[PDB]
């Protein structure tokens, strides 16, 4: 049967199913309603940065249509909606004056969600640093971000926390550090060879450290000031793709484990254990910032749940570790990616080149977190796949590969949960086709099709799949 035996009965009691978007990717009204620019507005408005020179000025216009979209997610039997608050829509300069029209939008959205029985899961940050803070403070290179972020978080907790009980601070700090400061392909476009400046061997580590300190500071403020009255929770969202040793050799197993540690351990070791992974300490040495004991104790235990963004898997091949002149965070791992074993590809690719369809990667990742980190509460906060540009409406709607994707991945998640993994929810990326960063509108991740000429929504087969699977 097309559900492949899946339904709410196949998951734990009260398990949460939702869809996910982010502010810049769906809201539109980027320079309206009092919103100040983010680093992504500046980046996307620069010729050549995004496919087609596209930007999120209008995006899906969820700003005007949010009741349509909430009605749609309710009709598809979802329980929750993960979305983000645009920092520069609340504080156009990142600090100081509040944009009340921006506050009113999120109040209206939250209140409508609650009216329709959809639980809001709210991210405070999703790549969209206020441009004013990048320019004034140097963004995530500056430890002062902990204070600036905490003050923004405090405002959001005070303003929305009587209603919002499920928060996340950040989305994928690894990707900000990697793309923004190692490879230099996302804002602020910093890297060793980059026009904006930078250093791919040091800045990714500074940036990751400042995300951890800022998360920890925001959660401390929540706990000491808001939690008693509001009784909510705050987590963080981290990407984790699976790494599988190419062979059972000691060097290949070591390589796969090094990749896990540099990918997810970079954040989870501090959040669970109060220190960076030993391998990172050993290889990155002086380029890896050191937490003071007090900072370590602030960071450890600071996530009430861990959001995991899971898409894909790779094989890893290793050799003996060697002394090498530092060049980049990426090179520090001393691993070799391989996308075939025994002459067979690990999986077929979706539209995005990095996205190999490998459902057992979901089991791999969830099992590994369960076994390595004492089975923390995990929420799968992003999972999905994309179609390419230029298809007809009907071709978008007949998204049979995405239907297969969700059925297979959710089956593998169910396998991990049935084996005891403490997974509390699952969120499909994305409710809607949207602005896919450097791909612009050329990558379609939605379970609902969006016609980017007319802005019309049309649910795809995968939307009806969810509606059927999730019926109460
Ligand atoms: C997770 O991945 C999707 C697909 O690349 C992005 O659109 C989201 O912003 C990111 F959070
Ligand atoms: Zn509009």
UniProtKB/Swiss-Prot annotation:
PANTHER family: BETA-GLUCOSIDASE 7, GLYCOSYL HYDROLASE. GO terms for molecular function: amygdalin beta-glucosidase activity; beta-D-fucosidase activity; beta-galactosidase activity; beta-gentiobiose beta-glucosidase activity; beta-glucosidase activity; beta-L-arabinosidase activity; beta-mannosidase activity; cellobiose glucosidase activity. It is found in: Secreted. A beta-D-glucoside binds at residues 25, 126, 171-172, 311, 382, 429, 436-437, 445. InterPro entries: Glyco_hydro_1 (IPR001360), Glycoside_hydrolase_SF (IPR017853). Coiled coil: none annotated. The lineage of its organism: Eukaryota, Viridiplantae, Streptophyta, Embryophyta, Tracheophyta. The keyword Acyltransferase does not apply. GO terms for biological process: carbohydrate metabolic process. Its EC number is 3.2.1.21. This is Beta-glucosidase 7. The active site is at residues 172, 382. Hydrolyzes p-nitrophenyl beta-D-glucoside, p-nitrophenyl beta-D-mannoside, p-nitrophenyl beta-D-galactoside, p-nitrophenyl beta-D-xyloside, p-nitrophenyl beta-D-fucoside, p-nitrophenyl beta-L-arabinoside, oligosaccharides, pyridoxine beta-D-glucoside and the cyanogenic glucosides amygdalin, prunasin and dhurrin. Possesses pyridoxine transglucosylation activity. Pfam families: Glyco_hydro_1.
């Amino acid at each position: 049967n097309w559900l492949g035996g899946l339904s709410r009965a196949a998951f734990p009691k009260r398990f949460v199913f939702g869809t996910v978007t982010s502010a810049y990717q769906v809201e539109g009204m980027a320079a309206s309603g009092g919103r100040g620019p983010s680093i992504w507005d500046a980046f996307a408005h620069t010729p050549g940065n995004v496919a087609g020179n596209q930007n999120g000025d209008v995006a899906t216009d969820q700003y005007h249509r949010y009741k349509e979209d909430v009605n749609l997610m309710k009709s598809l039997n979802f329980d929750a909606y993960r979305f983000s608050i645009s920092w520069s829509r609340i504080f156009p300069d990142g600090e100081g004056r509040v944009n009340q029209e921006g506050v009113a939008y999120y109040n209206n959205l939250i209140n409508y969600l609650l009216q329709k029985g959809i639980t809001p899961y709210v991210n405070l940050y999703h790549y969209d640093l206020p441009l004013a803070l990048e320019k004034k403070y140097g963004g995530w290179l500056n430890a002062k971000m902990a204070d600036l972020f905490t003050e923004y978080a405090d405002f959001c907790f005070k303003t929305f926390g009587n209603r919002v009980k499920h928060w996340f601070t950040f989305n994928q700090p690894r990707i900000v550090a990697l793309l923004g400061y190692d490879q230099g392909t996302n804002p602020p476009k910093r890297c060793t060879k980059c026009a904006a400046g930078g250093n791919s061997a040091t800045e990714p580590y500074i940036v990751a450290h400042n995300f951890l300190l800022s998360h920890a500071a925001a959660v401390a403020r929540y706990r000491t000031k808001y939690q008693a009255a509001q009784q909510g929770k705050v987590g963080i969202v981290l990407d984790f793709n699976w790494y599988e040793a190419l062979s059972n050799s000691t060097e290949d197993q070591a390589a796969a484990q090094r990749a896990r540690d540099f990918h997810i351990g970079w954040y989870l070791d501090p959040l669970i254990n109060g220190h960076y992974p030993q391998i990172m300490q050993d290889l990155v040495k002086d380029r890896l910032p050191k937490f003071t004991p007090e900072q370590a104790r602030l960071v450890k235990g600071s996530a009430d749940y861990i959001g995991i963004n899971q898409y894909t898997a790779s094989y890893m091949k290793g050799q003996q570790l060697m002394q090498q002149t530092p060049t980049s965070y990426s090179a520090d791992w001393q691993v070799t990616y391989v996308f075939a074993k025994n002459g067979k590809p690990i999986g077929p690719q979706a539209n995005s080149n990095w996205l190999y369809i490998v459902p057992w990667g979901m089991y791999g990742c969830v099992n590994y977190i369960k076994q390595k980190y004492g089975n923390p509460t995990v929420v799968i906060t992003e999972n999905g796949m994309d179609q390419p540009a230029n298809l007809s409406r009907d071709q978008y709607l007949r998204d049979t590969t995405r239907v297969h994707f969700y059925r297979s991945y959710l089956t593998q998640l169910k396998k991990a949960i049935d084996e005891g993994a403490n997974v509390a929810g699952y969120f499909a990326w994305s409710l809607l086709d949207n602005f896919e960063w450097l791909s612009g509108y050329t990558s379609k991740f939605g379970i609902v099709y969006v016609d980017f000429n007319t802005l019309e929504r049309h649910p795809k087969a995968s939307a009806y799949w969810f509606r059927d699977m999730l019926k109460h």
